[PDB]
Each structure stands twice: as structure tokens, then as C-alpha cells.
């Protein structure tokens, strides 16, 4: 499985400090997130300056980069995929798990094309992915959690239908709000994390471990030559 | 590693004790263990003759011997590391698991420079250090019971993670302070344990043994003629 | 494991009968055993009337043959047992779980001598002895139960621990008291139990066998000519 | 495991019907269900008579047929043992699980004769049958829960033990009273289970079926030419 | 619940034997099992000649005895219930399950008649029968075993139910089939265990008690003058 | 808890029905259930004709009958739930679980009257309910079911927070579709099952029950003269 | 238990919104959250309006309110508590469980006052609150969570421990930070949860709710004239 | 359950020592036991001198003493069980639980003597023992392990069925071989343990326990003027 | 239980400390600590000296102090415990787990002393201070530790024990090394814990609490006039 650590954001700012650290392994973009990136940097969203920055995303991180259809219905939806496809052989693309998002998956899919298949909230929409040639499902367990039940017990049941039917498909842990989403989605056997910067900053950080440091150079300084 | 036991000292007298006990597998150091052994023998501790210590501890344990870098940023780590490294082909290089750890992990992974991150005190840290290419993980068991809370869980947790996610680094339990934490790190499926000295001797102590011991001789001398 | 069933005595009688059977695997020694069949038989324990006896022995199980060693050192245990192994080969060396009996295991184990570590009496020490190349570790389960605690538990832990490590190393079954330990041994995964005759001669017997038995050759009679 | 059904039974009628369903793969005698078949039919005892059934019994099944020994020792169950294996190469022989029966275990095994142990009540009995070389190990459900104990708990020792152990035993569920006998062998996995004919005809009720096939049936006259 | 035993039968040779053992508590019929008794003697059954075996019953076992009508509808089941009860005050009557026997039993527990509500097979009709104001349910353990499905299950949800939602109603576990069956019920904390004479034989019968018995009377002999 | 049984219609013919079984306590109508009613008997809804309806369901039932408030602002519906509460005093006011009921809940519960808060989908809905002086809350088993989550899982929290809670509140099991939901309501130790007249009808349906029957009467009817 | 629920704020207009719900039993501050307040109203922080501030947060909330001291040592502790809880009956004086205030915890504990022992991170620091006579623990979740471990298994240890023991205290569950961490406190048996108004405003918020809500008004509105 | 410590022999010097440490309630004898102890002492087993050895022990434990009948038919028994209750007011009846037994139980307890029911191998026995009026069932663990089933299982069974059920009688754990027989049923809950004089020698050994002592007193000496 | 904490000391300022915290409830002295204490403080250790510091001690505390015999036979432990409880009404007389102890325990206890068994390892130990009219039993959980077995394991069956059979002893947690032991003797239901001063001042340590308080004050700061 070893579980890979995603950026869920559009910003190009935050996935560069992260890529230092060596451990990301890709980025998830959806249209909320491409939209607040274009907002705050001030510019405006030429299909052109999409593609440029998709592909600025993809040569940053050196992994995976997944971009979500717009379209309405399947036909358009195909189209959008190629295009999107098109920008970079890392990109990957996030169709909404739909009626309409299945019959897409599934053209896209054919043609070589790798799918994620998002907007998941039970098992069962995540099988139906499966079954229409999903290379990734997109479990979202904060908004899960924001309805009052358990995010957790959905990347569980879906983690453990795709174990026991041994289907091909991965798992995005999405949707992260706080870094025990992180560690449950590893000790489940997620196969991917996707989460906001904020959260991945936080993952590092222990006061043992500040502590621990402080002291240990102290203790070196004491009897150093 | 079928659980290994390692000793976390710089005193070759007890590095020489436990390994013709022949269940010595590795060492683990840090400069004030190095300074300890130093005083002792009252060498002046220049550069050179630090590294001539390990060196002679390698060459005594002849397995892993981990060696702390004091470096603060990432630039002068992965230098330090460089240095220690090429002391001999043995030495395991401990960075602490912060930002500037990661980065020197990464590019001194990629060197294929074996590397152990320190000061690990959550699953989510030990992720990272994984991520980021380490060899080895090292969380502290008593300094987590020190602040009360259940250091065993957190070994637990790193193991299961690595276990479930089929991460091939290596989970070794440190800050071990009595022998149930050997057992515990033992049965949960730690990869190593690294103790003091004075825990090490412990480990060998049940009554029943010593009694056995006296009662078998006794009974045998008494059929001698 | 493939369990296997041995004698824990040294009484050739005993061991002669069970080994008609067809399924005796094996027989464990010490001291206390060897001079009680020794004052049972009236005669003085010389180096002759040993090795004689334990030739008589490995010659009756054809299989495995457990022999003490008497010394407590290192050096002189590596002689005896040197000595012990060269009598027959079948004769497998038992050494106490001491730091002098890793300290011999070592060598032993080392040239090729089996090695069965004994008076075993917590996980911790069969790690110690699995790590110093032991090929047997062997638990008292029925000394544990006499000072109230629970024998099967220190089982348990050492078949858990051998387990999840994945050691090469055999798990003997000792002490053994009653009936009920042999199945635990079994259904644990331990790979022999030694156990006393009059606990082997136990095993086969069930009411319910005696009285089919015995109804079954009635019916017979009843209907044959 | 793939588990397979016999019949528990000497009657040849009784044979006949269920090896028509396609699902009996073999059958076990005892000298209580021999005797009852012959005084039921009235038919004299000899030993021409007996090879004669047994044979007939062997062409119906097509699979191993179970045959008991009644002699009291080791050397005439031997011979008795061989006699039965030459009615037919599918013969098994039966031994009860006593001194005897594993000393003409051994022996017969050794001469690529199957032997199926009977008469077993506890783990351990099939353990030592398992040493002795037995092909088959037959626990008696029903008449443990006779005496007011879980039959299905000495099924489950057993089958455990076996798993655990690996050993290439079989293990047939005999002594089976009810449906369920059948149902919890499958779940724990046993080999096969063997039970009488008012049993084997139990299985397949359940009146469900009948009612479904009613209605199937009269849902399809509604509609017909 | 303190559990009370019960013969299923109306055989008064039957009632008459387990009465005088002290521990019978009740007995129920129902149709089949009084036809039987009565195809034994070789009488009629008359409503006259019905009522003398109940009162025959009832005064030989001194406690509760379930007679059960015969009628379909709930206006004959309440005229027949009310002639029932008037043979002896110790009789209760049985009504099946269904809708009008829901219907009979509010009316005739309105009157302070005690009502046994029998032919149950799911929690849902143990429950329906306990809110028409049912003073016993019956669940049939072995009809359910009988068609493959665990008649133990049966008994646990149903006693489960009524311990959680602490109903009135008392659970007589009926259909029972061998001891276990009784021991399962004691455990679960059912009220009533109804069985047939042969099944009641049963329960006393393990082969270490006479072996006990034997043995203790051979030591006492031996010292005696 | 003594589980109560209610019917979840504003069918009068369905609830005279299960009300002459004697095992009927209640009713729950919604608004949708009502419409369908006076839909299906072709008269028009108006404030009387309600007032009406609900009379003849109290009158039919003697237990009961929850009647929805339709107005979104608090003050309306402290006003309707009067109007409601004052056709009969077996009437309890649904109030739906949103901010505004919250507030309605409060008042009209300080008044005196009953209150049952419906729909409800989460654990957290039904505490703040419980808080704002509800009688009774309704979670939804089917409609949960209905989005491929598990409607049993929100009845056990909401069960399991007011029993560790010790909460007065009544928790009715609503939305139910089939009889499982019956069970584990009954099994998890809820208060009242409300469902369709369909499943209600269902409960009895066991066919061993009918089988049971006939082959009683069969064997009855042979021993008559 | 009766869990109750509190907001975690010093705004008096979030507080007076879930107040009107007739839900709130109760308010936390801290001085983090009292600063925040005033620093948005642009009011200058003295002990005058303070006190005129928390005075109104009693008057608004009708029940306890949590107030901290700043003071570091006891004695002042002490002074400022006494100050504290002079100001409202209603005021619970918040103290850090540090050395010195256990000091002040037992003597204004002793003198009638209510204590709200907080900045709890383990359970043995709610067992020396306890102890020194504290009314409330409050662990804090969240902040728990912020460095990777489960605030969730902190609040069970405490709550589990307080259950076990019968201590008197009441356990706060704090630093909340989404719905769920409610639902696991209410499950748990945490006697208070305290949140924010951001989190108070999601409890309700579960979309089948306004779905339902939806339809039962279209189907309603349909049948009218 | 207050479980109490017996002595299982008629040893007067056993039951001399053990009175002596003040943990002794009572004491069981059977007739190997009673016929052992006059074997060993020379002395002929009359009527008069039985009754003088009973009314010896009663005297010097000060507590219930049980005694065996050795009749085997019911109204030989109760003849025999009225004279040992005559014997001294301590006496306890054993009876075996037979048949026969279970006739005289009833009408020796309806008279007010204690009976104790033994040779109890099953929960069913010991619940028709319950059901006759017995003060006291013996389950025998030992002889249970003998036959290679597990004898803690057996006193579970009925340990929990007379928790479960409520019923009066006491548990006597019997048959008992080692000290954790005893700690088994002081877990589980029996009311007494039985046990041989050379168990109850062994209950209070623990090696930690003598070097502790020491140890202490050492210090102790060091210390003294 | 209400679990209280004690201090494992003889130290008078360590005492004093702790006890101003307000969360002292008792002190546990053996002869080991009172050596050290007097050679520490350079005292002659007489009677006097011994009763004086006691004295001081019970002041101190101002509850339960417990003092050691040092007599290792029944009579002079009876007549030492009786000098010690005469020192001060709050002095719990020790004495060790042994025969003489039993005895001592027995006739002190009988006469209104309170007394501490101690040097305890085993349940079974406990179990016969128990019925020897101990009122506190102290296992030692740290020695255990130290021999490779599972301390805790040895209280949860003590706690286990007394609270499954009821008995009115109080369980001191002894022995404590580090403050999980304190965690798991609260969590147990252990009645006392009793630790040396520096596990005492670690219980308190969380630099989640410090980091917090720091912060709050920061906050206020900048607010403040």
C-alpha cells in the first residue's frame, strides 16, 4: 500500500515548501480550491493560464496532479478529461461520482486516461467506481464529520471492501481536516492522504520533540571541544 | 530484524560484555554518551578522535552504529552526515525528525546513506521520516510514560502503521527504561530495541533460574560417589 | 511446527515403553532426573555410567536427547558440552539461560552444536537465548504455576513473540504438569512438548474411548456366528 | 479443505440414494452399524459375507470406505488391518484410539495403508494419532454432547490444532446428531463430515425452497400458452 | 430466572419417573404429543377422556401444565382456553402464534388466565406474543436446527430481548433435542427448560461420576474391619 | 424500556386492524402520511377535517398519536402545537429537529406537553433535542439505509448516549422498513418501533409456525374416534 | 450523566443565539478567549468591566460560568478566585493544574467554591484534580489532536478513571473542534461538552433533515384546497 | 462471593497446621480420603471411630465439614445422611450426583441438613443438584484435566449459570491440583475453594517474597546502633 | 474505591512538600526506607528515634501511615505490631505475606489493628491475607517488572479478585516506577497507589499545560491596560 502524502490545494506556494521536505507524492486540485488560488493571486482564469498552472503543479512536485471536469454530462465530460489530460502526462483526472461521472469514468478510463472518481460518501458509490474503471476513489470524511457521523467509519468500510474484493483501485483520504484523519487513513491501509498545507505543516510538530532538541544541543554545547 | 537488541552507550567495556553474550546487533550513540566514555578514559575529544571511537565500535559490534549530527539546518546536516558516514560503512546517520531533518533524510537517502530519524513521539512523524527515505525510526517510549501517557501505544501505532502500509523501514524502540518495554516492543513486532547498559543486565534476572540452577547441582552431587 | 511429543525423565523403562507407541519424538534430561533414576537403580553416577546411560537413551528414542551441563562457566560449559554432543548424535546440549549460558551458546551454537536453553522463565530470556543462536528455548510452565502465576501465559508470551519475529528458533514445552498443558503447548503452535511419563500415559486415555470400545465388540458378538 | 460428506451407515440402500445426488464422496462403517445391518436384513455374519458388503459398499461410493478392525491387540489388528485393506483399494482402515491402536497405526501407515482413528474425545488423543501416522482422525460429536459437553469445542481443538500444527491429518466430524453438527465442521474447517442418512436427508430442507418453488412455478403457469 | 426443568411429553409413566427426582417443575403437551400417548394405550380421545389425562398430569407433577387448543380462530381459541383452565388451576393454555392466537391471548391474560404463546421460530413473534399479554413464550430450538439454522440464536435474541427490555414474560426453550440444548438455556438465562423424557435421562449421565463412585467405594472397603 | 409497538400511518383501516390484536400502543402520522390518507378517501384537508381524523385514530388506538406542526418559525409552531395538543389529550406534537423546533420544543414542553422531535439522522440531532425537553425522538433507520449508511448504526448511538446518559427521553425507531429493524430496535433496548402497516403484517410471518399447526391437528384429528 | 452543553466563548451575541434554543447550560472562558472579545469590541481590559462583562454572560446563560485566574503563585491564585466568584453566584473558577494550583484548588474548593481545574493533557494530572477537590476536569481534545495523538483516548482514560473510581468530579470536555468530538463525549459519559459557537451551529446541521422537511410541506400543500 | 479457603483431606494434622494460619473455613473429605487417613494411623474404619475422626475435625477448624455417604440407593442414603448430620451441626452431607442422589438431596435438604452434591463433571449436574436442593455443587477440575478437557471450563459453566440464574448454591471448587486452580476460581467467582494440604503449602511461596525479606532486614542491620 | 495517592517514603521533607498540594492522603514506610532515611540524615536508628519519626510522620500526613515489623515470627510481630500502633492512632502495622505473617495478621486485625500485608506477588498471596483479616494488601508491581513479568497484570487480578468476590481489603498499589503504574492502578479500580516523591512530582508534568498557560498569559497581556 505505502501510503502516499498528498497537497489538496491549488496554491503553487504552498506545494513548493512541502516537496523540500521530500515526502509529497502529489497534488489534488478541485474547482473551490483552483478558484480561491486564482481569487487571491488576482488574476483570471484563461484556459490557457489553467493549463499553465496545472502544468507548473505537475513539474513542482514530480508526481500525480489530479484536476476536476466542470462539464455537466457525460460526452462533455470525456472531452474535458482529454484536454485536461492533455497538459501533462501526471495529470489525473477527477470526475464527480455521478450517473453521468460513471459513463465518463468509464470512456476515459478505456482510452488509458486515469480517473479519480470524487465527491464519495458511502462504500457503495465508491464500488460503483470501482466497477466503472476508477484508478482512484475520493472518500471526503471532514464534510462526513460536519453531519454529525463518523468520516472515519466511511474510509473504513471502503478501505476494507477494496482489501477484501482485492479491487485495483486506490484510495484518497480526502476531505482532511485535522492530522488523526492522517493517522487513521494509515492505519486503516489508505493508500493515499490528500490534505489542506495547514494540516501537513502541523503533522511534524511534538513538544517532546521541541524539547527534546533544545536539550540535546544544550548537551552537546556543555562538553563540546 | 528478528528483533535485534542494540545498546545505547559509547563504552566499548559494555559494548564487549554484551556481545560475547552473541546478542549484540547494533549501537546507538549520541556526543554526551561519546563525551561520557571520554572522560572516563580522560582522551581529549578533538573531531578526529570522536570519529576514531566510532570507528572502533564499529569495528567491535560489527553492525549498525548510529551517530547523532549537532548540525542545526539541513545544509550543514547532510554534511555532517556525509562525514559520518565515511567513518565506516557501518555508521547509521540520526537526524531529528523536524523540517531540516527531512531534507537532510532525503538527500542523504538518496546518497544511500542509511538514516535514522530521531525524537519521533507520534505515527505521524514516523510517516514522514518514512516518506522522506529513512532506514530507521526511532520512537521514545519513556519519555512519552514520562509525561502520562502510554508510550506502548505509540510503539504500537508506528509498528502497525509500517506493518498495514508494508513500509520497509525499520521501527526501533529507544528511551527504554525496564525490561517489559523489551518484551512489549518484542511481541508488538518492533524491528529493534536499543537500551542502556544497566536495562540490558536486567533482562537475564528471574529467581526461579538461580534456584533451578542450585537445586539441579545439589541433587546431582549427591549420586557422585 | 508439525508438534512433536517427547519424555521429560531418564528412566529407560519410561522411555521405552512410550517409544514402543510410535510416537515418541524425543527425551529431555537434567540433573534432578538423571540422579533420581541413578539413586533408583542403586548405582554411583561416574563420567562412564553417564555416557552409558545417555547412549542407552539416544539408542531407545532415536530421536533428539537433551543433556545438562553442570558447569557455570563459560569456558568449561563449551568444553562439556563439546564433550556431551560428542557421546552421540543425537545428543542435544542444554545450557541454563544465564549470561554465562549465552556466553556458551554462542560458541556452541556457533560450531554447529544444538543448543536447547532451559530454565527459561519469562519471554526475555528465550529473546535473549533465540538472539545468541539457541536452536531450543525451553519454558517451565508448571514452576510458574507453583508460585501462583499463570505458566501458560509465559508460553503464550514466548510462541507470540517467536512468532510475530519470525525466529528460527524451537519452542520446547516444559515442566509440564497435566494433560491440559500438552494441548495448550499444541494449540499455541509450540513445537514439542516434554512432558513426565505419567502425564504421556494420560494423553490416551478418555472414558468414552473404554466404553465404545467395549460396546462396539459387544454388538459385534451379538450378530457374528 | 474442501470439505466432503459421507454417509454414516452399513446400509446399502441408504448408500445408493444420496451417491445419486452427486454429493457423497465416501463412508463409515463401525462394527455396531455392520451388525445392525445384517440383523436387519438377516443375513449371517461371516467373514466372506462381511468382504462381500464392504465391496459392494466401496462400488456404490466410489470414494474411501472405513472399516473397524475388532481385534483386541496390536498384532492381530495388523493382520486384520491388511485383510481389509485387500477387499478393495479404496478400504480405510478404522483403529480405536487406545496403546494398541497407535502401535498398529504406526505399522499399518508405514505400509501406505490409510488408517482412520477412532473412538477420539480429546485433543490430545488426535494429536498422538496424528504422531502415530494416522490419515484420519475421527472426534465423536454427539456422544460428548451426551455427557453434557460441547462436542462442537472438541471439533474445534481439534481442527485448530491442526491448522496450527500443519499437519497433514484429516479430520472427519463423526458421532453427528443434527444439521448444525454439519454446518459449524464447515465453518471451523474440517476435512469431512460423516453423519447417518436421516441426517444427510435433513440438509437439504428448508421450507423456503418449497414455498419459492411454488411460487415460481404457479407465477409461470399464470402467464403459459 | 432461577431456571426451572419441565418434561415435554404427556406420558404420565414419563412424569411420574423425573417427578420423584425432585427437580421437576411443569410439564407441557401440545397436540402431537397427546395423540401419541393416547395411540399408546390404545383410547379414544374424548374431551372427557382429554381432561381426566390432564387432571392426571396436574396432580402428579404439581406445578404448571400447558394444554393447547386445537381451534384456528381467536372467538374458539378464547372458549376453548376458558374450558382448558377450568380442568386445574396448574393448566395454562398453549395458543399458536399467529394473528388469532395474538387475539385470544390479550383476552384470555385479560381474564387471568395464563397464557403460553408456542409455535414461535423469530424474536418478532416472541415479542408480539409478549405484548398481547403473553405469561410464557416458547421458542422451538430443535425445528430450527432441524431446518439448518442455529436454534440456539433463536433462544439468545429472544432472551436477550426480554432482559434488555425487562418483560414480564418468562422463555420456555422447547424443541429441545440433547443436553446441551439445556446447558445453552441455563447460560443464556432462559426461565424454563422443557424436554422430553429421553433427553432428561440424559443430563446426569457422565462416565466419571460412576468411575468416582466405583473407586471411592473400593478405597473405603479396603480399611473397613 | 418494554418495547411498545406503533403503527407509522394515517390509515384508520390499518390501524383498527393491528389495534384488535391487542399489541397496537401508539401511532405516528407525518405530514406526507396524512396527505396520502385524505388523497386516498378523496376528501379535502382542512384544519377540521384533520382535527377530525386525529380524533378517530386516538379513539381507535387508546394510546398515543403523534401529529407534525407544518409552520417553519418557532412561535407558529407553538401555536399549531397547541391547537394540536388540544384535539386530544393522547395527541403528542412532532416538531421537525432544526433551530426553530429546538425553540418550539422548549416551550411547549415547559407547557406540559408531549413532544416528539423528528427527523432526525444523527446522534448529535437527538441530544440537542433531548436538551431542549423532548419526550421523544425519532431517528430515521430507512432513509439512512436509503444513502447506503447504516440506519441501525444511528438507532445504537442514539440508544447507547441515552442509556450511558441516563437521558428521560423515549427513543422511537422510525422509518422502518423491513422486520430486522424491529429486532434490533427491540434488541438494542429502544423504546417504541413505529412502522408501515406492511411490516407490521410481516412479523408473524415464520412458516414453520403454519407447518407447525397443521401436522398438530393431522396427528389430532387421527386419535378421534 | 445527563451530558449538558456549553459554548466556549466570551461573546455575549454568540451566546445569547443558542441560549434562546432553550440547549445551554452553561459557558467556558479562558483568558485567550476573554482577550479576543475585547479586543473586537475595542474595550479596555480592567478588573471593572471584567467583572461587568462576566456578570452579563451569568445573567444571559442562567448557569455556570467559567472564569480563569492569571495569577501564577497560590496565594494570589486564592485572592483572585475569591474575587472571581464573588462577582455571580454563578462563577466557577477556572485554575491551571499546575503545582500551585492544586495549592489554590483545595482551599477555595475548601471554602465552598466551585473549581474548574484545566489545561489538562493526561489522566493523572484529572486525578490530582480531583484530589485537591475540584468540581470540573477539563482535558482539552483538540489541542491533543494538534500533536497526532487521540484526544478522544485522553477523555476516555479520564472519564473511564472517574467512572471506575466514583470520583464526584465532572468531566468538561474541551477544546472541541467538530461535531463528533461531542457525539464520542456524549457516548463516553463526559458529564459537560463545551464549544465553540462555530461547532454549536453544526450539531443540528444534517441535510436529510431540510430534505424531509421539504417534501412533508409539498405533499402537504397538495391535498389542500 | 467471599470466596473461602477449604482443606480437601482427613488428615487432622494437616487441618491442625493450616487452622493455625487463621485462613481456614472448612473442610471436605471423601472415602479414599477418610479411608487414607485411618490406613495411615493403623486404626480400624468402624462406625463410632468415623464419628469420633468427624466430630474431631469439626471441632478443630471450626467450620463446615463435609462427609460422604457411601450408601448408593436413596433411602439408604437419606438413613445414612440423617446419621453423619447427627454427628456434629457442622456437618455437611456429600451425596453423588446420581439418580438416586438427587431423590435423597431433595428430602435430607427438606429437612434442613446442608447437602453437598459431588462428583459433579458437568453444568447440568450441577444444575439438576440446584433443582433437588443443594447447598453446595462440587465440580472436579482435576480429574476433568485427567481426561485431557479442560476443568476451568467446567467450574465457568457453573459458576456463570448460577450467577446468570440467581441461584442459591455455592460453587465448591474441587478436584484441585495447583495454586491456579485456586486463583481460576477465585476470578471466576466459585464461593469455595477444596484444596490438597500440599497446594494450600504452596499458595503463599514466591521467591520475590523471601528475597524481599531479606533483603529488608539486611538494610534493616545496617542501620541498627 | 475513590483511589488515593500516597507517598512510598520515610523522607519528612518529601512528605511535606506533597502534602501541601492537598493530595496526600497516607504514607507507606518499609525498612529499607527508614534505613535510609536515618543513615542519610546521620541518626541513630533506636526506638525512640524510630517512634518519634513515625509520630512526625502521621502529623504530617494526617492520615494512614504504615510501619514494618522486622520479628520473623508470629508472637514478636504481634507484640511489635502493638508497640507500633501505640505510636499513633494512624499507624497500619506491616508485616510480610508468610506463614508468621498470616498468623500475626489474624490475631492483630482480630484485636482492632489495622494491618498492610505486604511483600505480596501472587493473587493467591493476597487472597490469603484477605481471610486473614488483612485491611490493605500491596503488591508490587515495579519487582515484577523487573523480572520480565507484567507488574500490572498482577494488580488487575488482585483488583479483579476483591472486587468479583467482595472482599472488604484495600488494594495499595506498591512498588511504582513511573506514572502509567499510577494511570493503570486508577484505571484498574485500585484503592490506593502509593510512589516514590519523584514519580509523585512527574504526575503533574505536561508541557501541553505549560505551552497553554504561557500562551493565555501572552494573550491577556497585550490587552491589558
Known amino acids: 500500500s505505502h501510503m502516499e502524502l498528498y497537497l489538496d490545494t491549488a496554491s503553487l506556494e504552498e506545494i513548493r515548501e512541502i516537496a523540500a521536505w521530500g515526502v509529497l507524492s502529489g497534488v489534488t486540485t478541485n474547482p473551490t480550491l483552483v478558484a480561491k488560488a486564482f481569487a487571491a493571486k488576482g488574476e483570471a482564469l484563461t484556459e490557457e493560464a489553467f493549463a499553465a498552472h496545472l502544468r507548473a503543479i505537475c513539474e513542482t512536485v ?3 496532479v489530479s484536476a476536476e471536469v466542470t462539464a455537466l454530462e457525460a460526452e462533455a465530460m470525456v472531452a474535458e478529461g482529454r484536454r485536461l489530460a492533455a497538459i501533462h502526462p501526471n495529470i489525473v483526472v477527477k470526475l464527480p461520482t455521478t450517473e453521468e461521472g460513471l459513463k465518463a469514468c468509464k470512456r476515459l478510463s478505456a482510452e488509458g486516461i486515469k480517473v479519480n472518481m470524487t465527491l464519495i460518501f458511502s462504500a457503495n458509490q465508491a464500488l460503483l467506481a470501482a466497477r466503472a474503471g476508477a484508478s482512484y476513489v475520493s472518500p471526503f470524511l471532514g464534510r462526513v464529520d460536519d453531519i454529525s ?4 467509519e466511511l474510509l473504513r468500510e471502503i478501505v476494507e471492501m477494496i482489501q477484501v474484493q482485492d479491487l485495483p483501485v486506490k484510495v484518497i483520504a480526502a476531505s482532511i481536516r485535522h492530522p488523526r484523519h492522517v493517522t487513521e487513513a494509515a492505519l486503516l491501509g489508505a ?8 494540516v501537513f505543516k502541523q503533522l511534524l510538530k511534538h513538544p517532546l520533540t521541541d524539547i527534546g532538541l533544545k536539550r540535546f544541543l544544550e548537551d552537546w554545547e556543555k562538553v563540546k571541544p
Open 62 to 64: 514530480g508526481g500525480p
Open 191 to 198: 493508500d493515499i492522504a490528500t490534505m489542506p498545507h495547514a
Open 149 to 152: 457521523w463518523d468520516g472515519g
